[PDB]
Structures are given as C-alpha cells and as structure tokens.
Amino acid sequence: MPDVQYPINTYGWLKKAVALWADRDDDEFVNQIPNFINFAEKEIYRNLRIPPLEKEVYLDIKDGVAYIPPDYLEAQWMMRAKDGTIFQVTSPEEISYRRQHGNQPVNFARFGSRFIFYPSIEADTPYYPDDGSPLIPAENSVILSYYADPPEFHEDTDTSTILTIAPELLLYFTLRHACLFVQDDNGVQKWSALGKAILDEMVEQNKKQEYSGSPIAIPNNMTRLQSS
Amino acid sequence: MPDVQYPINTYGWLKKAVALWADRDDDEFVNQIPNFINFAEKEIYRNLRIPPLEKEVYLDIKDGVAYIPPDYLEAQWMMRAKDGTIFQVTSPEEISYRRQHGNQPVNFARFGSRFIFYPSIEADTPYYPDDGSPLIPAENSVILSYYADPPEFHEDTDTSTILTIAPELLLYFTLRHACLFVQDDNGVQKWSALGKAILDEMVEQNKKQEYSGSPIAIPNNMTRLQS
C-alpha cells in the first residue's frame, strides 16, 4: 500500500518498506512494526561485532574500584596515551596471587561490574558535571576501546549506519518476527536464511579486513631484549 | 484491539502483547497469561547465568560457619575487602582433613546450608543505619558474588532487566507454554526454537566479553616465592 524511495535511509521509510515487502499490512500490524524492528536489532547487536559500533574512551581507574561503563559489550585493545602499552586480561586468582607475591607488564580482570588492576593505578579524568573542557588529557590516562551498544530508534528522522550500509539485513530480520506475529513459516525460514547470509557476508568482510596488508612470519622471537 | 507500546518495558504491556500475539480474547485464556509468564521466567532463570542478575553481599562469619542466603543459585569469586585473597571451593573430606593434618590459603565447603571455612575466619557486617547515611563497610570483611534469583512480578508496573534486554525471550517462552495449554504443536516448536536461538545468542554474547583480549600462549608462571 504505502510508497517508498529507492534508498531506505531512515526509520520512517524502513517501517513502511517493511509493510510494503509484506502485503500483511493493516492497523493491528503496522502498530507493532516498531516492536519487530526492536527484536531484529536486538538479535543483530547481540553478536554482531564490527568497527562502526565501536567506541574509544578514557577511564578512571582509582586503583581498583574502576567500574565498567553501561555500554560495555566486548573489549578491544586497551592501552595508554603515553609511549604506548597494551594490557592483558587474566583471572581473579592471578591478580590475587600477584598482590601478595611481588612493573613492566600490567594485567586486569573483571570483578562483577569493575575492572581491577594489580598495580595502584592513578588514572585521572574530569569529573561528571565538567562543562566542555577537553582537559588536554594528562599522563597515566588509559584509553579503552570496546564495542558499544547502539541506540534504539525513537524518531522517524533517526538514522543509523546500518541503514546506510545494509538495510536489507534489518528488513529481513524484522520480516522474520513479522511473519511470526502472523501465522507463516515459509517466509520466516526464507527471511531468516537471507538475514543470516547477509550477516555472514558482513562478518567475513570484517575478517578479511583485519591483518590484510601483508603476510606474516614470526621472526623467531626469543626476547632479544633481556638486559633491561 | 489490545494496543501495546513500542518500548515493551513492563508487566502489563508484556501481558497485553502475549494476548495480542495469541489473538484469542477470552477469559479462559487471558486469566492464565500470568501462569504462562511465571512458567517462562522459572524456565529461564533456572539455568541462565549472566552478570546483571548477580549480587554482592557481606557475610557474617561467627566461627568458621555461615548460612547461605535464601536467594542463592550459584556462587562465583569470593574474597576479602582487602588484599584480595580469592577463596577456592573444596570438599568436606578435605576441609576436615586440613584440621587434623594442619602464606595461609583459604578453603570453604557447603554442608547443606552452611559455608564452612577451615581457618576459622571472622567476618562482620557494616553499619546498618537507614538515616540517609553510608553503610560504612567493616574491617575484616568477606565479599561474595552469586547469581541471585529475581523476584516474581506480582504487579503490572513492575519490570526487570530482561524486559529491556530481551523481551522477545520471555514472550516466546511463555507463548510456548500457552500453545502447550491449547493443543498447538507447530506453534510450540516454532516458539521453542526461537527462544532457544535467543538464549544461545545471549550466552554467546556473555562469552565474547570474557578473558578474550589476549593471546592464549605463554602459560603463566605463578610458581612460588622460591626462584
């Protein structure tokens, strides 16, 4: 019934293309298209890991109590902004052992909703109500890179990189839940297969993107640097 | 025309959506939606283990004894408020042999409904006062992180982290028991498959946030103080 333009750029046109690609369109159906899209995006971001949904940010360690941000889903490289240094993640028992038994390497763990560090780190960041003030990040400022949970659509004008990069993915993953809402199985299976194929293509692209500029050959690393 | 909202975040809207995806509008069926949601939430939390439903609480060790909370499902890392000293679980036959044949590691067991620590550690609870004052944690404390079981809704406006994270999960798992009540097999199969896929996605997400960001080689060397 409804019309739509060639590019599905925004939520407003996606919620109409959904009803178009499925003639099952009416009052009792269009009102829940938002819920189907919500379920589809949740099913997507639950396991999708790609750059465009990443986010880098400084942390405040406070030697221990340092807390995990709300948007934490998976941690990428973690380091500082001074001469470079990469942390490695270990288990709580290793850190508890390091505490008593005893600074080039630095470890960390995940205690519930915290990030513990064996050394008494003193990373500094501006407080909450600070107005602007980039602060010219001081030293001992760790920078964390992780995968952040993207926002949920709340306005027809609201757009997202997924719409501009792969709208068919959302359209199929939401037609799945649509054909589930109504009684239909063939469409469910076909849309699920197509969405899974698109997601596989995207993750394979991400894979072929990483470490894709030259071959590798470990040069028999046996710690040439031992003197220190 | 039962109309639900887009951000499904409460118990009433979830109930209305369950009654919507099962178009039948009859008292014989609507009056049991609460029972179906109860069965679903009891099916999910019975084996779901994730951070958000965890909880931290201070124990009240008197003399190498304790009592498990009434909301205990599974225990993970335990330690003290200072220096760490993660505890490690053992069995009765060992924590009772240590006493006979026994810088100081810690061990604990489960004697039905009582944690039994060998060294006879002592713990204390923090300041209780509710006069808008901090808890003022106590010295010689022991922290425990367990997967607490959530409370039943028993109210419309009530909610939970699941309704915001994965409402489709509870929706499908309760429509499963609904389509079991009425003899509908294909629907049962579809809803169960969808719920299983959702739970698989969730547990996989909980695994890709674990100790992943590092090589698995160079096995650690936590040997001893004797080099």
Partner: peptide, 27 residues
C-alpha cells in the same frame, strides 16, 4: 580497601546525604 557493588538506588540515596550539611553551612 574494596567495597561491594550496591544497587543504583542505594548509591543515589548515598549521594543525597551530601546536601543537609551544605544547607546548614550555607545557612
């Protein structure tokens, strides 16, 4: 020197504890 993770409501109530003293010191 490490504490437990209270619920958000408890942290909120703890934050408001830092108002009455200020109100008196301003009075």
């Amino acid at each position: 020197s490490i504490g437990a993770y209270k619920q958000a409501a408890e942290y909120a109530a703890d934050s408001k504890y830092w108002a009455l003293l200020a109100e008196s010191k301003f009075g």
